[PDB]
Amino acid sequence: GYGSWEIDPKDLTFLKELGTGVVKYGKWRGQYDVAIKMIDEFIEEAKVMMNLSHEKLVQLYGVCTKQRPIFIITEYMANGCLLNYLREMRHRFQTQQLLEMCKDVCEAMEYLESKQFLHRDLAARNCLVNDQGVVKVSDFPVRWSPPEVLMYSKFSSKSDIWAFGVLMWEIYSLGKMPYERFTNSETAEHIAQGLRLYRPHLASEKVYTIMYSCWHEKADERPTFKILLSNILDVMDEES
Numbered sequence: 108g109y110g111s112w113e114i115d116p117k118d119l120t121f122l123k124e125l126g127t128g129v130v131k132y133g134k135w136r137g138q139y140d141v142a143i144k145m146i147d148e149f150i151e152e153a154k155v156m157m158n159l160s161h162e163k164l165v166q167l168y169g170v171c172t173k174q175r176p177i178f179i180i181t182e183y184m185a186n187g188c189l190l191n192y193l194r195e196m197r198h199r200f201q202t203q204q205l206l207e208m209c210k211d212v213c214e215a216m217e218y219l220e221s222k223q224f225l226h227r228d229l230a231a232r233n234c235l236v237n238d239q240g241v242v243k244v245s246d247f248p249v250r251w252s253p254p255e256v257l258m259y260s261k262f263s264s265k266s267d268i269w270a271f272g273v274l275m276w277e278i279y280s281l282g283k284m285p286y287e288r289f290t291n292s293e294t295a296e297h298i299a300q301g302l303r304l305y306r307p308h309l310a311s312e313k314v315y316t317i318m319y320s321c322w323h324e325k326a327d328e329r330p331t332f333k334i335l336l337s338n339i340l341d342v343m344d345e346e347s
């Protein structure tokens with residue numbers, strides 16, 4: 108048994124399909140909006156989620172494991188995927204809020220960092236946005252990877268840092284694909300040569316400094332999420 112995490116499937120009301128396992132929108136005891144994910148490796152995700160809880164991380168509500176198919180149930184993020192939000196919902200946010208989106212993600216990642224947990228696929232496509240426009244972290248990505256990952260499969264806290272910088276770039280470019288004119292192969296070559304993503308027009312020089320610091324050639328020279336959070340706050344205070 109999964110203790111207090113076990114949900115009675117009878118308490119669920121399915122309403123709409125969200126993405127295809129299969130994720131659906133519904134209500135839990137007719138009161139709470141939820142997302143429901145249908146299918147040992149699948150249940151591994153839930154176990155990870157039972158041990159992680161933060162305001163900017165998509166929250167597990169429970170699991171249905173006594174019935175096939177098995178369900179994983181989370182909070183419902185009304186505005187969907189961050190990538191699509193950036194591309195399709197620009198009428199709903201101003202330039203000042205771009206940094207707030209970065210701060211939301213940075214807070215989630217600082218929490219993960221403190222738990223010595225690696226995300227390994229940080230990108231806008233893996234973030235969700237709620238009804239209030241709050242961004243939360245959810246769940247080969249060459250364009251989000253540092254040279255040591257592409258060359259040696261060297262994953263660390265510093266590979267999440269690199270990926271975060273690319274995410275910041277995604278936000279400030281309003282959801283452009285990083286290295287938009289290159290293939291994955293070309294991107295890897297260019298990254299190894301020390302080429303870096305240009306400054307998006309919406310990014311001030313101080314904002315760009317933050318994202319650029321995430322892309323230092325030497326992993327050990329990249330900041331931590333604790334440092335990045337303080338930098339973002341400082342810029343927020345100066346530019347707002």
Ligand SMILES: Cc1ccc(NC(=O)/C=C/c2ccccc2)cc1C(=O)Nc1cnc2[nH]c(-c3ccccc3)nc2c1
Nearest residue numbers: 125142143144165179181182183184185186187244245246
């Ligand atoms: C159901 C489910 C189960 C598990 C996970 N796993 C993690 O979040 C990982 C966390 C994590 C793990 C480790 C570390 C960090 C984070 C996610 C989900 C999940 O897709 N939830 C969801 C919520 N709201 C949504 N809104 C829309 C939408 C709305 C409108 C349009 C389109 C789409 N789709 C949604 C989907």
